[PDB]
Curated annotation (Swiss-Prot):
The gene is KDM4D. GO terms for molecular function: chromatin DNA binding; damaged DNA binding; histone demethylase activity; histone H3K9 demethylase activity; histone H3K9me2/H3K9me3 demethylase activity; metal ion binding. Zn(2+) binds at C228, H234, C300, C302. It comes from the Eukaryota. It catalyses: N(6),N(6),N(6)-trimethyl-L-lysyl(9)-[histone H3] + 2 2-oxoglutarate + 2 O2 = N(6)-methyl-L-lysyl(9)-[histone H3] + 2 formaldehyde + 2 succinate + 2 CO2. Residues 136-302 form the JmjC domain. Binds 1 Fe(2+) ion per subunit. Histone demethylase that specifically demethylates 'Lys-9' of histone H3, thereby playing a central role in histone code. Does not demethylate histone H3 'Lys-4', H3 'Lys-27', H3 'Lys-36' nor H4 'Lys-20'. Demethylates both di- and trimethylated H3 'Lys-9' residue, while it has no activity on monomethylated residues. Demethylation of Lys residue generates formaldehyde and succinate. This is Lysine-specific demethylase 4D. It is found in: Nucleus. Residues 8-50 form the JmjN domain.
């Protein structure tokens, strides 16, 4: 069995190996990469996402979100307070202001310590889930706006044509901006490219151990758990590495830097934080191996999680018994 300890693997494809996305995902899996829940892919040195980042300041962040925490330093929830629109140039200036800028630190480990000690005492502002892309149209390899769609994959594997589209999203971050513990919608893969700026630290639980995380989360967030059998789908709960280690939960950590891709695998719980001003692009995708995870994915039917249009068909075809309850939650 490849990668039995479920370590995060790092890949260095050549330019030739970078030509066929599906083939390279399947290669990484043949080496056991999925067992970690997360892999890093360093593009060949011949590759670039676009020519420069000099021309992005006029992108609008229509609904910046202030991430306000409740709880204790290692076990907290965050809610997202809506703020007034601002451009990427305005947001960058904000991120670099004295109130929000990254503190002096020694190394990634010292910054991680500072994040876990101090995150709850501040409310950083995140530009999330902005539809769009920063890949140049002439980038032909690993262009996240030109991947095969999930609707086409379901059609190829199962034979049924479905409505829906699959497009990328941009994330503009600053110090302490946080992504809570979650798997992807319908336990899909994701791919995330860090276009520019400061790093992003990730935490991940192996898919084979995902239920251990869920059980701890129900214990640590007991009112949220009563509210929703799939409350991690609300994407609000944070648990520190120290708390995970105290509770014997298997996990790994890694820091992504600008110019690097991360792939999350089906049912790989993940969480993390940004080091400073940055911009990432991410999209969900599927392979033949995903279908069995999609059929078994939990769902939030309480009203909170509220998702994309395109999830309807995935529930409807893969989970017909759950569909009527899930849809009632959407309305
Ligand atoms: O960068 C982010 O805010 C969040 N990362 C992810 O959840 C991802 O690509 O799946
Ligand atoms: Mg611009
Ligand atoms: Ni994610
Ligand atoms: Zn819910």
């Amino acid at each position: 069995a490849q990668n039995p300890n479920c370590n995060i693997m790092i890949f260095h494809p050549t330019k030739e190996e970078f030509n066929d996305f599906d083939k390279y995902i399947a290669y990484m899996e043949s080496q056991g990469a999925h067992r970690a829940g997360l892999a890093k892919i360093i593009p060949p040195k011949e590759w670039k996402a676009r020519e420069t980042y000099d021309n992005i300041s006029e992108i609008l962040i229509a609904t910046p979100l202030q991430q306000v925490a409740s709880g204790r330093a290692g076990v907290f929830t965050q809610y997202h307070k809506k703020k007034k629109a601002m451009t990427v140039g305005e947001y960058r200036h904000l991120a670099n202001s004295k109130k929000y800028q990254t503190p002096p630190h020694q190394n990634f480990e010292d910054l991680e310590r500072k994040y876990w000690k101090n995150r709850i005492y501040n409310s950083p502002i995140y530009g999330a889930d902005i539809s769009g892309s920063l890949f140049d149209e002439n980038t032909k390899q690993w262009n996240l706006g030109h991947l095969g769609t999930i609707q086409d994959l379901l059609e190829k594997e199962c034979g049924v044509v479905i409505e829906g589209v699959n497009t990328p999203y941009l994330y503009f971050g600053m110090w302490k901006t946080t992504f809570a513990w979650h798997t992807e919608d319908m336990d899909l893969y994701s791919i995330n490219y860090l276009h520019l700026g400061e790093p992003k630290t990730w935490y991940v639980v192996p898919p084979e151990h995902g239920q251990r995380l869920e059980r701890l989360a129900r214990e640590l967030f007991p009112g949220s758990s009563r509210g929703c059998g799939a409350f991690l789908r609300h994407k609000v709960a944070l648990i520190s590495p120290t708390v995970l280690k105290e509770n014997g939960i298997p996990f790994n950590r890694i820091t992504q830097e600008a110019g690097e891709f991360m792939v999350t695998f089906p049912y790989g719980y993940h969480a993390g934080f940004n080091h400073g001003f940055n911009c990432a692009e991410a999209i969900n995708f599927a392979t033949p191996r995903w279908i069995d995870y999609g059929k078994m994915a939990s769902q939030c039917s309480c009203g909170e999680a509220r998702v994309t249009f395109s999830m309807d068909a995935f529930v409807r075809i893969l989970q017909p018994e759950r569909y009527d309850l899930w849809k009632r939650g959407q309305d």
